[model samples]
Target: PTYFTNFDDYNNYPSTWSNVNTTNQDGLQGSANKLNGETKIKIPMSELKPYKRYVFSGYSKDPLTSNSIIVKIKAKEEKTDYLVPEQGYTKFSYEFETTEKDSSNIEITLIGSGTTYLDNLSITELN
Candidate 1:
């Protein structure tokens, strides 16, 4: 599972995170609290596959700003995407099955800035 807190809590950039290098100063603030309205988590293409049903779930809370959040699931080789509910105070549990037999990797990215915390993720293949 993936867990996230806040910039003020973690003093910005948490360990093991490769922030997306953005040119815009507002967006490139790798600090835990990215001013840019976009934050992403990149799962290596070397992992994850397709053809089986998988569960992408997590919990999120924003006791700070009133900004909308987007959960984007991108296939490593495709541009098509899926999005979770984007609103206020959400504890989401999303599930989807893939159609491809072989795909690169999957990136479950949380897009939006402000203050939010997330955790609890379990991925497994269906029988």
Candidate 2:
């Protein structure tokens, strides 16, 4: 899986996340939650090429046993959210090419707060 999470490695955490609000503690050695509450990741606009195509993929928890996970992808300059729902523990991925070459942050927010876990976050540039 391009986007996979193995907590054993501690690669996923709130402190490790980038571009998040300076006040937002999305990454920390032991602060990342895989069971309850919501943790988000945002990349600084400077890290990515604005007008390039890339593949985005990751894993999310259902939070609600009977419901799906809600995700909102907000790219800098984007006025609205790029939201999509996926079933619990289901790997979700999509391909999108950028059109602008500016510093734009990419944010991942989780919905349905509860003990939730995320693993295997993968992104790759495509031609």
Candidate 3:
């Protein structure tokens, strides 16, 4: 039914992600990741099942460190993208249906100028 990945609890550091000390809406002590210009963080979704609908959600905080924060997802059959302006912590989400040939992986990319803080990432099955 549901699956989630919270950056607040992520231990292993991916070379692609930059360490950023920040708090979430809950005021929890957790380190977030900064998505600078043209930085793509590839999150593996090896547990994805075919023929299911999923909703991907996450929090992004733009500290005006850059001009814009572009969120991207590249899947086997679908590629979705979003752009957030310079502002405080904001929520973003998207839904998609899986295919038989899906790679079971999702690529989260940050594009454009500026520093976009990412945390509380989650993927949930809708059906």
Give per-candidate clash totals: 1, 18, 1
Better of 1 and 2 by TM-score: 2
| Regions of candidate 3 where Cα sits further than 4 Å from its true position | 10-29, 38-46, 101-106
RMSD of each: 7.9, 6.8, 4.5
All candidates' lDDT scores? Answer: 0.44, 0.49, 0.58
Best candidate according to TM-score: 3
- After superposition, which runs of candidate 1 have C-alpha atoms over 4 Å from their true positions? 1-37, 44-46, 76-90, 99-103
Best of the candidates, lDDT = 3
Tens-place lDDT per residue, model 2, 10-127, is 3533234432222222222222235343446666545667676666676554435444445555663333233233344555666655556565556656553444455556666777
- Candidate 1 residue pairs that clash: 12-32
lDDT measured at residue 45 in model 3 versus the true structure, 0 to 100: 50
TM-score-based ranking, best first?
3, 2, 1
lDDT (Cα, tens digit) per residue for candidate 3, span 1-127? 2654455655342324333434544321366555555655554554466767777676776665355655666655556565674466677787776666444555655565655666666667786
Error of 1 at 9 (Å): 17
